[PDB]
Every structure is written in C-alpha cells, then in structure tokens.
Amino acid sequence: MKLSEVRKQLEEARKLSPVELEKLVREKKRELMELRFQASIGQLSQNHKIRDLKRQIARLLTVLNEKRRQ
RNA sequence: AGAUGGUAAGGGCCCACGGUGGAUGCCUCGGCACCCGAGCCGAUGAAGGACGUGGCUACCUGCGAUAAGCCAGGGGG
Numbered sequence: 001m002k003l004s005e006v007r008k009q010l011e012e013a014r015k016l017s018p019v020e021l022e023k024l025v026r027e028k029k030r031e032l033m034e035l036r037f038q039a040s041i042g043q044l045s046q047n048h049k050i051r052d053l054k055r056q057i058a059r060l061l062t063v064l065n066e067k068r069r070q
Numbered sequence: 071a072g073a074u075g076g077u078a079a080g081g082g083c084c085c086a087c088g089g090u091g092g093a094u095g096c097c098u099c100g101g102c103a104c105c106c107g108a109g110c111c112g113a114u115g116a117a118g119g120a121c122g123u124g125g126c127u128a129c130c131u132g133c134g135a136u137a138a139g140c141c142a143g144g145g146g147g
C-alpha cells in the first residue's frame with residue numbers, strides 16, 4: 001500500500017470504536033478470503049493485494065488492541 | 071657347404087600428448103590464542119523445541135493465525 005494510504009488508514013482507524021474496528025476487521029478478513037479464492041483459481045494477477053489486506057488487518061487489530069489496552 | 075639380415079602375437083626402455091586423480095602454490099567467508107569489554111534468563115511462562123507462516127516456496131533465515139511481519143520513537147538518505 002502507498003505510505004499515504006497507510007497513514008490515512010491508521011488515522012481513520014484510531015477514530016473508530018472497538019465495535020466498529022471488529023466489524024471492519026471481519027469484513028476485511030472476508031475480502032481476504034475472496035482474494036484467496038481468486039488466487040486459487042489463477043484469476044488474481046494483482047497478487048500484491050493479498051499481502052496488503054493482511055497487513056491492513058494487522059494494523060486494524062493493532063489499533064483495536066490499542067483502544068482496549070487502557 | 072657356409073655364413074649373416076627383414077618377422078613382433080605381444081613385451082621392455084625412452085620421448086611427445088592426453089585421460090584419471092587432486093598434491094603443490096596462491097587465496098580465505100572460518101578457526102585458534104591472549105587481552106579488554108561485558109555478564110544472568112524464567113509463572114508477565116525461560117532455556118530449548120513442535121507445527122505453521124510467502125501470489126508461486128524444498129530448505130535456511132525471519133516471524134507467530136496481526137505470522138519475511140503490526141504500532142511508535144531514534145538513526146539514515
């Protein structure tokens with residue numbers, strides 16, 4: 001992902017509630033599966049998207065853990 | 071009547087050139103010694119492991135379902 005898009009992702013994430021972060025992670029893990037399915041049938045030439053979503057999910061869960069940690 | 075040479079199936083010695091083999095010399099990522107520095111880790115689960123982890127990934131390295139990585143500060147360019 002572009003550095004600017006990563007910065008923005010964290011800014012918006014840090015404004016979300018724990019509940020919204022959970023819902024969002026759930027949806028991104030759903031999209032990851034969809035990406036897996038495509039990569040499995042050789043229909044995902046943009047394979048960089050898989051790593052990207054995975055790190056997004058990690059960033060999201062990192063912030064979720066941030067919110068809950070205090 | 072007599073006398074003495076050319077035979078090389080193959081062999082021997084020498085010479086040339088190869089093959090095999092990996093000595094020798096050069097080399098060094100590694101090692102050895104001494105000296106100095108530094109010196110504990112663990113139930114907040116250690117030491118050490120198993121299994122995982124990559125779009126394609128056998129192994130090694132890293133990492134742990136957030137899985138060759140997540141956040142932030144510092145360095146750097």
Ligand SMILES: [Mg+2]
Pocket residue numbers: 006
């Ligand atoms: Mg990043």
Ligand SMILES: [Mg+2]
Pocket residue numbers: none
């Ligand atoms: Mg004769």
Ligand SMILES: [Mg+2]
Pocket residue numbers: 078
């Ligand atoms: Mg002869």
Ligand SMILES: [Mg+2]
Pocket residue numbers: none
């Ligand atoms: Mg002959």
Ligand SMILES: [Mg+2]
Pocket residue numbers: 082
């Ligand atoms: Mg002889």
Ligand SMILES: [Mg+2]
Pocket residue numbers: 088
């Ligand atoms: Mg020879």
Ligand SMILES: [Mg+2]
Pocket residue numbers: none
């Ligand atoms: Mg020889």
Ligand SMILES: [Mg+2]
Pocket residue numbers: none
């Ligand atoms: Mg050789």
Ligand SMILES: [Mg+2]
Pocket residue numbers: none
């Ligand atoms: Mg020498």
Ligand SMILES: [Mg+2]
Pocket residue numbers: 109
């Ligand atoms: Mg020590």
Ligand SMILES: [Mg+2]
Pocket residue numbers: none
């Ligand atoms: Mg261990």
Ligand SMILES: [Mg+2]
Pocket residue numbers: none
């Ligand atoms: Mg491994």
Ligand SMILES: [Mg+2]
Pocket residue numbers: none
């Ligand atoms: Mg960082």
Ligand SMILES: [Mg+2]
Pocket residue numbers: none
């Ligand atoms: Mg940094």
Ligand SMILES: [Mg+2]
Pocket residue numbers: none
């Ligand atoms: Mg920096």
